[PDB]
Scaffold this active site. Structure first.
Site, PDB file in Angstrom:
ATOM      1  CE  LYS A 148     -26.012  18.826  30.092  1.00  0.00           C
ATOM      2  NZ  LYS A 148     -26.015  19.332  31.493  1.00  0.00           N
TER       3      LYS A 148
ATOM      4  CG  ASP B 202     -22.567  20.607  40.776  1.00  0.00           C
ATOM      5  OD1 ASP B 202     -21.666  20.605  41.641  1.00  0.00           O
ATOM      6  OD2 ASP B 202     -22.688  19.699  39.927  1.00  0.00           O
TER       7      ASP B 202
HETATM    8  C1  LIG Z   1      -8.111  24.312  26.587  1.00  0.00           C
HETATM    9  O1  LIG Z   1      -9.119  25.022  25.867  1.00  0.00           O
HETATM   10  C2  LIG Z   1     -10.453  24.675  26.099  1.00  0.00           C
HETATM   11  C3  LIG Z   1     -11.423  25.375  25.348  1.00  0.00           C
HETATM   12  C4  LIG Z   1     -12.788  25.092  25.532  1.00  0.00           C
HETATM   13  C5  LIG Z   1     -13.177  24.103  26.463  1.00  0.00           C
HETATM   14  C6  LIG Z   1     -14.600  23.787  26.691  1.00  0.00           C
HETATM   15  O2  LIG Z   1     -14.971  22.782  27.286  1.00  0.00           O
HETATM   16  N1  LIG Z   1     -15.492  24.694  26.228  1.00  0.00           N
HETATM   17  C7  LIG Z   1     -16.891  24.663  26.686  1.00  0.00           C
HETATM   18  N2  LIG Z   1     -17.810  25.647  26.411  1.00  0.00           N
HETATM   19  C8  LIG Z   1     -19.043  25.405  26.968  1.00  0.00           C
HETATM   20  C9  LIG Z   1     -19.040  24.188  27.682  1.00  0.00           C
HETATM   21  C10 LIG Z   1     -20.128  23.676  28.375  1.00  0.00           C
HETATM   22  C11 LIG Z   1     -19.993  22.402  28.969  1.00  0.00           C
HETATM   23  C12 LIG Z   1     -21.060  21.865  29.699  1.00  0.00           C
HETATM   24  C13 LIG Z   1     -22.245  22.624  29.822  1.00  0.00           C
HETATM   25  C14 LIG Z   1     -23.370  22.103  30.605  1.00  0.00           C
HETATM   26  O3  LIG Z   1     -24.242  22.899  30.954  1.00  0.00           O
HETATM   27  O4  LIG Z   1     -23.395  20.914  30.930  1.00  0.00           O
HETATM   28  C15 LIG Z   1     -22.387  23.878  29.190  1.00  0.00           C
HETATM   29  C16 LIG Z   1     -21.326  24.412  28.459  1.00  0.00           C
HETATM   30  S1  LIG Z   1     -17.551  23.399  27.644  1.00  0.00           S
HETATM   31  C17 LIG Z   1     -12.205  23.381  27.195  1.00  0.00           C
HETATM   32  C18 LIG Z   1     -10.841  23.664  27.011  1.00  0.00           C
END
Ligand SMILES: COc1ccc(C(=O)Nc2ncc(-c3ccc(C(=O)O)cc3)s2)cc1
Length: 329
Positions: free
Chosen positions: A67, A155
């Site tokens: 991020k 949130d």
């Molecule tokens: C369709 O298969 C998928 C597989 C994985 C994902 C995906 O986004 N994985 C993710 N793993 C961790 C994610 C994550 C996103 C934001 C934040 C935060 O704190 O801001 C922390 C962790 S996003 C999305 C779709």
């Protein structure tokens, strides 16, 4: 003649009794990792103030999420970072595996553990009655833990609850709005998704606490068992409260406002109208009965209550019979 102050009924002085460096994130010194250990793979969703990408740790070939913190306010970055560290290791709390920055630009980026989240845009279906009780229980673990650590998520919503169903893996994410709880502090009511904003926020009551988060939780439980996401679907913040009032009723809403001597906007009183408190059964149908039970309704009813002070704590919720099987297991 003035809003009645309020304070958390649990974990009230959790931060008061800890060292100054635990909640004083403004003075928090960050240790930087190595930016070159990662390579961005693709962009995920988006966001205002941040860019999230799926990535890979070049040192171990492990998938990770990065991020990038866009130009904003260092304090905000310090707050989320300090909070993420304070909670690191907590049950179902997203893990902050690293923190890096552009040596030249200075642009901060947070590296999180990767979660192969099952598409929710159409998944809460195959979710069985037991799957919901289980995940709800797991979400409760994270909340009681974070609340125990003097922190409000602020949130809670389906999008911030990553779920890798194949591995029955769950994680609470995006602590971007999380804040430290200090008794008697007036917080910004403009947090959390509209459909997940608690009555306190909707009526602008600022001295809220951890209870904001079980209301949001209650909303998620509702949408999940009744199969209606979001459960409370308002046009704007004003309408949001009307949607809640049409279910919980207006009398209780008014006793609440009366109790805390809260002043509502004139026009707001006109749009709220008059509504009776509907029974939850009214929302169950042939397509969601298999997910609904007396226990679920009793638990939900104890979560969705106007007075934040009367809502169940995450700890008390984990004891509800709704979770008998889960715990037993
Ligand atoms: C369709 O298969 C998928 C597989 C994985 C994902 C995906 O986004 N994985 C993710 N793993 C961790 C994610 C994550 C996103 C934001 C934040 C935060 O704190 O801001 C922390 C962790 S996003 C999305 C779709």
């Amino acid at each position: 003649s003035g809003p009645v102050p309020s304070r958390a009924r649990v974990y009230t002085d959790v931060n008061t009794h800890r060292p100054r460096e635990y909640w004083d994130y403004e003075s928090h010194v960050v240790e930087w990792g190595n930016q070159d250990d990662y390579q961005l793979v693709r962009k995920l969703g988006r966001g205002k103030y941040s860019e999230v990408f799926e990535a890979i740790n070049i040192t171990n070939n492990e998938k990770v999420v990065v991020k990038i913190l866009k130009p904003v306010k260092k304090k905000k970055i310090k707050r989320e970072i300090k909070i993420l560290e304070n909670l690191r290791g907590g049950p179902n709390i997203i893990t902050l595996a690293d923190i890096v920055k552009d040596p030249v630009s200075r642009t901060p980026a947070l590296v999180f553990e990767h979660v192969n989240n099952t598409d929710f845009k159409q998944l809460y279906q195959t979710l069985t009655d037991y799957d919901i009780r289980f995940y709800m229980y797991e979400i409760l673990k994270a909340l009681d833990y974070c609340h125990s650590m003097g922190i409000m998520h602020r949130d809670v919503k389906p999008h911030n609850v990553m779920i890798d169903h194949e591995h029955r893996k769950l994680r609470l994410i995006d602590w971007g709005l999380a804040e430290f709880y200090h008794p008697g502090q007036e917080y910004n009511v403009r947090v959390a998704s509209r459909y997940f904003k608690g009555p306190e926020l909707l009526v602008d009551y600022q001295m809220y606490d951890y209870s904001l988060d079980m209301w949001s939780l209650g909303c998620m439980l509702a949408s999940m068992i009744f199969r209606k996401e979001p459960f409370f679907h308002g046009h704007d913040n004003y309408d949001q409260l009307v949607r809640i009032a049409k279910v919980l009723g207006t009398e209780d809403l008014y006793d609440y406002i009366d109790k805390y001597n809260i002043e509502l906007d004139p026009r707001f009183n006109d749009i709220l109208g008059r509504h009776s408190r509907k029974r939850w059964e009214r929302f169950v149908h042939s397509e969601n009965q298999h997910l609904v039970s007396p226990e679920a309704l009793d638990f939900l009813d104890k979560l969705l209550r106007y007075d934040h002070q009367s809502r169940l704590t995450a700890r008390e919720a984990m004891e509800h019979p709704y979770f008998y099987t889960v715990v037993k297991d």
